[PDB]
Amino acid sequence: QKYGSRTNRGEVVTTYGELQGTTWNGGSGSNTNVELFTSLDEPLTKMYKFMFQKLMDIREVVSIKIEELGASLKDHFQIDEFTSVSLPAQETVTVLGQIGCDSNGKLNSKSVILEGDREHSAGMQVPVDLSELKDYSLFPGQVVIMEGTNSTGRRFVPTKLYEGVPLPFHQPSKEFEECPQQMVITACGPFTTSDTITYDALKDLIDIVNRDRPDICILLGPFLDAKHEQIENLQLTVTFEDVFKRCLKMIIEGTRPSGCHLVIVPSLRDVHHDPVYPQPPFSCFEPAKEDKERVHFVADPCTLSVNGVVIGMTSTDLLFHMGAEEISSSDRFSRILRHILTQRSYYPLYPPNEEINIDYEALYSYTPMPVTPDVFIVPSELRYFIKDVTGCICINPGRLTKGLVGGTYARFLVKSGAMRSTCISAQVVRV
Amino acid sequence: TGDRKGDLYPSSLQFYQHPPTENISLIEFETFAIERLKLLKAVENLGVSYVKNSEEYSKKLELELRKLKFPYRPLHEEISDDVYDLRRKDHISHFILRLAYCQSEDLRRWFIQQEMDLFKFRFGLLTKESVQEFLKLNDLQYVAISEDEKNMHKEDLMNSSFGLSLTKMEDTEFYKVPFQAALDLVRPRKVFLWRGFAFIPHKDIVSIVLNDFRAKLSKALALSARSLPVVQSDERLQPLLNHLSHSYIGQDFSSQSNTGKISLEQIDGFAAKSFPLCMRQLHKSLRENHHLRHGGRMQYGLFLKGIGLTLEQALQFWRLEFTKGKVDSEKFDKVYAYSIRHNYGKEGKRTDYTPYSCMKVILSNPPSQGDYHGCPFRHSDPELLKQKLQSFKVPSSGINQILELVKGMHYQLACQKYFELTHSVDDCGFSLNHPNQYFAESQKLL
Amino acid sequence: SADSPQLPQDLKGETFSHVFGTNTSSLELFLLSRKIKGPSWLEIKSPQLSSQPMSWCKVEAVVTRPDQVSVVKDLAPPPVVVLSLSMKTVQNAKTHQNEIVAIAALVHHTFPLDKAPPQPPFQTHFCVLSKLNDCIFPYDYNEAVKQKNANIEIALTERTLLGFFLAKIHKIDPDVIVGHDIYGFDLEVLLQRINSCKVPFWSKIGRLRRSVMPKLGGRSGFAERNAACGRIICDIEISAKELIRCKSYHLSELVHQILKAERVVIPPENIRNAYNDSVHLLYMLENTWIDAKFILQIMCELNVLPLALQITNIAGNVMSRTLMGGRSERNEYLLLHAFTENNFIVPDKPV
Amino acid sequence: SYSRFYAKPLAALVTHQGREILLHTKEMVQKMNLEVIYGDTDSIMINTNCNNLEEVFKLGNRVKSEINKSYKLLEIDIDGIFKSLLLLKKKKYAALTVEPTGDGKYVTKQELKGLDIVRRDWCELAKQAGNYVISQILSDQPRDSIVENIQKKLTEIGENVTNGTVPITQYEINKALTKDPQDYPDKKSLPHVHVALWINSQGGRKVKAGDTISYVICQDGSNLSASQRAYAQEQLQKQENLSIDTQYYLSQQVHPVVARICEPIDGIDSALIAMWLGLDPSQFRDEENDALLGGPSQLTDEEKYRDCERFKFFCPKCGTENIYDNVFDGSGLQIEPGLKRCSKPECDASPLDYVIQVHNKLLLDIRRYIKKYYSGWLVCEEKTCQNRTRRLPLSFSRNGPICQACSKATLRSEYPEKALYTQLCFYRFIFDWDYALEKVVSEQERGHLKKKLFQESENQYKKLKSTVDQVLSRSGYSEVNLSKLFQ
Ligand code: SF4
Ligand SMILES: [Zn+2]
């Protein structure tokens, strides 16, 4: 009722980049090449056996994460030697470690501990005293290098916190120099109103897709939300798989006129899918022979290459997860986004939030960020935004539905080699 | 060859050379391991009790192989799916037990012995055709002599094989082997050599085959012991492999279900003939000193539970007994009652409500001075044991047999022999691995 | 010659495949060449005189060729000067540093290495006390100190205290300095306060005249910094960990288990409150003196020094590395001597 | 590895030979009717089972001879003798060290290793109880006398507490404040932080870091966790609505301190100690022995799944909970599949009609259990610490992660992989028609169930089991890669 009678349909709630006309048109995915970013590491494309984590394996994965990031930072900063975190230090020493909270609550400036890696510290921890640090921004699981002293052997006092070093951007090949600008419409779940299971917002978005004919449509989960009031109280008369199959059929068949490449990203809130992160791609739907080349069932997180433009995307609410734990000396979202980019992982928070199941071997293998993406799609319960963080266009299109009321989606234009202005324009628009 | 089969298992017998490469389930792993442990323990017990060439040995081993569903007979039909399954079992189980039986030299020797015995039996059940097939598939390349050549060297063959009769010799076929493999036969000059080949009858060949097998197996066990650190990290398989050698392979008695009704008045009578010595001793002590120490208290009480005493019944039993000395009702209610209650409960460490098995009594909780629990066949001095048996008026010859078995550390078998004597049955028809089983069988014989 | 460059470890040529011994240390070459196995009496032929002093030692000599040093045999070890050192420090809540506020030292001038530990374990002793930077002394500190009739020196600053300590170490010239957590706490704090107060001649803590202070421990550790080069530093923590089992190796536990005594720990908040009364300050200084006495007594009771001498002689290494513990080379030298005596090319030291 | 002479092959060979020697020594000692109660490359702890010191020395000489026979160059020495030993871990025991004075007479000295409690917020009641328990264990009396004395003292303490004869000073708990009270992330669960916040709110001397807060847990009629019901002693004496929470002081103060020393005794468990103290045992309820009694692979279904949650399904019609723990319910010809009739006699609804809802609830339950497993909750195994954390520290001992609260005990998973595997196996079990027919069901019942009128139920049960089978097919705990084992 409330959604159907909305009056702000099509309103542009946020804008960035070159001004464009009131109407956006795309190439219908004609001269479009969508693939997974070809990096050294193989992508997650199939289910991996889970529910069996050895504490030793978790220890090894965390330790190697710290060690690898510290090695890269040491080469970049020309640091001579790292020192064990636990040992006393009367003079200033450089220490590599990861941040954490001394208790189970939320991190605060008086509850910070630094845990070293196995190579340099035997995994030992030390309390941290942030009284002598003038500026800082710390979240649990953050790999840091600090110059400080430990006079009592019991409390590390940092004096310098080395800044993060983001990965270099992608240097596109000339193969896509002559390709036109590409239009991407991105939306995130939930796709149905809190009190309905009819997917009205999804129908409106599909109508928008057919109207504007974008080159890529990135749909992020959930598609059958686990927190939907109907799902939790067991009022559904059909199986979860059937509802999800109906939703996917609606999406794929309804986009036939647009000829738009669909990129489907699962969510941890998908009640019908495996609850593990990194999430494998959906595998319960077989597109018809006429839609096989258009539909891309990708994994969470995903690094996509679109005519040379690298788009990073994750369904996980990274900003909400890290905002609850980040502590700063004095834009918060920009700080968190820079933290994500500099840590070079799509989920650097450790321990994770209570709402995400992390398989740490798969996390090690499939969460490293190959490069710094040209566009980074990070849907969040927080407010929509389009930010420029260290040259990367971070887009939060919100969620298509916000409770009983309609939500928002985003549309942006990407061209490889433009001007670094790989993102010509971007807009958060209302549904 | 239904769905996912192949030529991986041509013949029944194998040298177990190539490790399995499949992905099996944990349940399948455990089932196969335990089943082959049962098979090997049966082989060991039958070897101790009977002569390996005896017909009783063959009959009992065939019965065990049929019961546990292991390949023991050939089939001139084809590779039927069921047959394939059985062979797969055998192949995987063997290697699992290798992982179980490579940690200690003792264990290694035991494993090797049992395996050799089993292999010998299976070879003994192979028809000549099948035998040749086997000898070919493993590149042993031993040639079966022709009839014409046999007649050509008839007299030489007759004088070569010890105790071979003319007609009986005509009924036998020999094999040609390089003399480097028949060292143990040639060295004492018990097989004819012609042009570098020994002519080995159908009886000696198994020996050579076994020699080869043993060599290989020993090497394999060494390698396995060298590759142990990779397996210890797998907690799932650690409780099993590290303790398989000490795994009880009998039936369960924790759940009484239908154990019958036993009146306290019967208990004394049972101690005459139905209680195994381990329990009988405890009963005697309880009726003499009117008290048992923790060990005994547990052992005996759990045994009673196994034979069907109900919680109330046990409370009465123990109550009266302790009350007949240095204990009053209040004391039994404050200190001891809880013990019995837990013995009859289903919460604890599984050693509190589970009747103890023979192995639990023999290899755990050795009695000290003044403690009357444990296995008498193990924890009592041999001479003392002899005296006890004399007190029971068991025939001297039987006593000797029992003592011999005890000297071989075959305690359970000793107990079995005692049973067979007391009930006057030549064959008991069961393998003793639990005192409660003992009791039940006694009652079945009444 | 050692002044010529050093060949690469991975050096290879058309005629030769590998090169061994490129990074062999001079000390290792000397010890293995002259067959010097641990402390011993050495004879030097044709000794020379140094142009300028190179050490803080009474006598100096120079030998041009290593072949001039020979091992005398069968003679008894000489006595050594042993100094047991304790110090009271206070953490500065503002500067986050430990300020040395008192030092106590017990000195035995003739300590045996092959006989039984002396009774008493010390002959002389000195103490130095300082004010905590605007924590003025009690009114009558001087009169109380004089009445105590002890060798107590009052320093008006940490700088003067450190200068006095270095002067005393130079004059006494201990062969062995024994402390608890001396490698990990005492030496590091001493060096930091010397370079913070700008005290000259830090090298008087050692025996060689050094201008640049050693690099921080890093991976090697606090012990492998050689702050007091030429002096054998005995940390009873490491020696106890090697020679006796205890629930913990803090000084109080060692006192309880080895000496069967009770050790009084002045709380940190009480050390700075001891500057209200002369009695309290004297109690703090006596606590430091008692701690030095306890360290020396534990050293004597465990017979750390004779055992270190015997271990060094058996292995054939440097005694300082024997008493350092940890990853220091002790038995590697036994194997090195055996292999060199049996015509072997010993492996190159890992780098 | 840092050694100048590092030779991985040589070290591996030496370690392998040491393993062989250790196992052979265990076998020898066992054959001698003795027990090796601990073994490491550095030491062997053997149970002589003798009450005479002379026989102990004889057995030691005999063991040395038996070892030397198989290994001539292995020279062993006796490092000590204990008259009594309560052992929880190497470096965690209480014992009566024996120093022999010659001529068959010896002196005993108490030796406690690793029994100190890192936490100092313990009431004097618990400290005295623990001291008495250790005194009883380290007496030369037999086991039965020790247990009787312990029971006597625990019942006495419980009765004294419940009778209000305990001095109030012995209920006081002192805890140090290591921060400003407002700066504790877990302030809600911390009682001393609660009391510090109250003290600061009152308006007196504010309590900063380094201050010791003294508090007593009191019952005030609030239905709030014990942490919130923490009051200063003066407040308890003044309010007149405050009473000491005796149940807390017996369950959370005395019971841990006593069970950490008494649970190791065979025949005494936490439930028994709770019963002796006067509490409700319901709230408190070795691989070698398991193998000796059957092993983990030969357990009955009831024992295999006794800690697993049963399948709860609310009837859509009546809304009454239905608990499913087996495929079939009832006995004899009255036996039918559980999902055929509702548990409420007045309800005619058949859960088999709402099989879509049953499927959805099954998937939701599987998600719940997977989430529980991946939460990664760890609890300290030490009773006196019981630290609960989500963070896995990289500092590991030989047994696993080292608890960062006490630095002396191992962190164990609250919901290990075996728990989740057994839960999924149980959910498969409660839908396994064929297995139930073969094993669980009797003969006449099997005949009655192996006819028509149940084929539709059989098909629905097969479909429901397919879900749990699909989930288990994606579990790494249920698969053994034989390629990794045999190479
Ligand atoms: S062998 Fe078993 S049944 Fe026989 S006396 Fe020993 S424990 Fe009892
Ligand atoms: Zn109902």
Ligand SMILES: [Zn+2]
């Ligand atoms: Zn702990």
